[PDB]
From Swiss-Prot, chain B:
Organism: Mycobacterium tuberculosis (strain ATCC 25618 / H37Rv)
Binding site for 5-phospho-alpha-D-ribose 1-diphosphate: 83, 86-87, 91, 93-96, 111-119, 123
Protein name: Anthranilate phosphoribosyltransferase
GO biological process, one term: L-tryptophan biosynthetic process
SUPFAM superfamilies: Nucleoside phosphorylase/phosphoribosyltransferase catalytic domain, Nucleoside phosphorylase/phosphoribosyltransferase N-terminal domain
Domain of life: Bacteria
GO molecular function, one term: magnesium ion binding
Length: 346, 343
């Protein structure tokens, strides 16, 4: 009964889909049964209609239902992700990746969902590769990385091979669509907490709704300068997800003594340049990049706390203390070194 | 210009800049657009809501790439009778029947046409079933027009470069802005027409495109949804003359037309719809004849607008259309059309 003309017609009529229709569509896409034209029409039509949390949740659900999972009982109940949509139009250093290393060094289990560049000069995966970290590990070895090192990296194309038809279309049309939301929503380890960047201000709330439905503890963040991270150049909008509900907040780092930075102070380069930036921060270099890394690490720790009960300002103060200490003690630098060793000993 | 630029502008619900729609269409027409890009553009353009300028650019590009007719072979007063189709009703081929009657009345007709998309039989299918050569090239359409009084430009024959767009249309199977282009891309470029639009909220856009060309056109939408002048109720007419458009409500009851039911205009496959043509041309009285005469008269009114007064124009149109059938001229013109193609 479901068909492309039905679903696409409903969307072009600016109507929300019926329950299960978005899922049907995504499943057709993920099983190689959709024509490129159908994939593109669907992505564009959903985007222009304004996707609902129900709809985006169905898309992400289908992706997760096809993904390679991690082995049973290898992901702690309190694992966290630090990942964004990307596509903010700014070539920054890899802030989520740097933050993730610091969070893990603070003792919070991290299973990060990641990928190579799409529109930037160096993606988190590119940069980790340049640092000597193995980005190509399957379920079993990601699980061992998490256990042994404190952090695992799930390379999206490795865990989502059936997404390859959609990815090709995303590339061909260029324009961001609802598909650009799915990465942060489809970590195959299914961590229940996260700091989740959204480049698209008008779609952050919908992302937050999806996390709320699965009762995650997440901060969905959009820098008011456009960054899909908590920014240091100005305020950030946060959609705070806890206990199945979303509430919208504005966050000002000046409240925690952060000086305002300029966006060009966070600029990145190629994989080697961004790798150097990771080494500089973990080595104790003070300055704007460190500040942005500590701020986002703290945010992820706050999300982790919310799995409990948790109070906002004490949570942030503790998160900032822990993030800063994880760098200052050398723990974060050492953790990266241990991560690199781990991959070379497989 | 680029796909990310243009698609991004559309997904931001912004009208395009001058020339951008044309750039896009030309990419599509030169085989330089990926199916995904074709599909994204068609959907994005549709959901943003296209403007007359934009649709005009699209049609302009198609006409640039189309096979033209030979110089000085289309009369300045040639008329088209063609609609968007996709009105969700499987009717007999009212435009095609009206076209024959109009030609038989002596008004030069160069009809743009095609096979079925959503229906059981398109005008081209029905003409084929009647024995008409539908796939003639430019030289022979011009001869048909001169010698028979009607020519049929088969869209696939004259718009080869459109095949990639056509394939994507079929694949996504939902109407888009592309569904507006048929009536706007007759390669003979007739300056008058009776032009049906299934999509009430886009008829004004189509009328705007014709206004830009200073065509004399009646863009029509039956208030029952028909992409023809209907006989079951009133119709909306976007009348185009002197580069301006005015919206009218039209009731054929004012000309003595009894109200019909939509089911009475229902059609079927090419053989059945061909039989309906033969029936009407043979003098059969009924709702189908009425609808044919009404739309034939509409086209004659548009032809007259190249120069007349509205109500007198309609009276004359109805008279000429009825007489074209009743004298047998219409039936004989069809026979002559068939013989032409065989020789
Ligand atoms: O090249 P763009 O278009 O900007 O997209 C990149 O940002 C995404 C999220 O990046 P991450 O948040 O995972 O990592 P990071 O912030 O850089 O450390 C990555 O999947 C990558 O596709
Ligand atoms: O099958 P659907 O979806 O209805 O579309 C058909 O109607 C178009 C216009 O038809 P016409 O107006 O040219 O001819 P007609 O009214 O039928 O005599 C044709 O190109 C054909 O694609
Ligand atoms: Mg960026
Ligand atoms: Mg990030
Ligand atoms: Mg119809
Ligand atoms: Mg018609």
């Amino acid at each position: 009964v479901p068909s492309w003309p039905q679903i696409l017609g409903r969307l072009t009529d600016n109507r929300d889909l019926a329950r299960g229709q978005a899922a049907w569509a995504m499943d057709q896409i993920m099983t190689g049964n959709a024509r490129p034209a159908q994939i593109a029409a669907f992505a564009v039509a959903m985007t222009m209609k304004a996707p609902t949390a129900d709809e985006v949740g169905e898309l992400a659900g289908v992706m997760l239902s096809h993904a390679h999972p991690l082995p049973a009982d290898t992901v702690p109940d309190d694992a966290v992700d630090v990942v964004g949509t990307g596509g903010d139009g700014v070539n920054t250093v890899n802030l989520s990746t740097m933050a993730a290393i610091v969070v893990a060094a603070a003792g919070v289990p991290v299973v990060k969902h990641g990928n190579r560049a799409a529109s930037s000069l160096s993606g988190g995966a590119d940069t980790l590769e340049a640092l000597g970290v193995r980005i190509d590990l399957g379920p079993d070895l990601v699980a061992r990385s998490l256990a042994e090192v404190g952090i695992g990296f799930c390379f999206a194309p490795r865990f989502h091979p059936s997404y390859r038809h959609a990815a090709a279309v995303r590339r061909e049309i260029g324009v961001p669509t609802v598909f650009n939301l799915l990465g942060p929503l489809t970590n195959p380890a299914r961590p229940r907490a996260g700091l989740i960047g959204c480049a698209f201000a008008d779609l952050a709330e919908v992302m937050a709704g999806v996390f709320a439905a699965r009762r995650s503890s997440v901060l969905v963040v959009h820098g008011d300068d456009g960054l899909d991270e908590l920014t240091t150049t100005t305020t950030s909008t946060i959609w705070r997800v806890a206990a199945g509900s979303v509430d919208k907040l504005t966050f000002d780092p000046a409240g925690f003594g952060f000086a305002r930075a300029q966006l060009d102070q966070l600029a990145g380069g190629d994989a080697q340049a961004n790798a150097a930036a990771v080494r500089a921060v973990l080595g104790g270099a003070r300055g704007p990049v460190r500040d942005a890394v500590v701020l986002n690490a703290a945010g992820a720790i706050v999300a982790h706390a919310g799995l409990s009960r948790a109070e906002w300002l004490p949570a942030w103060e503790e998160g900032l203390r822990r993030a800063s200490a994880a760098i200052d003690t050398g723990a974060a630098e050492q953790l990266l070194a241990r991560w690199v060793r781990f991959g070379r000993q497989i």
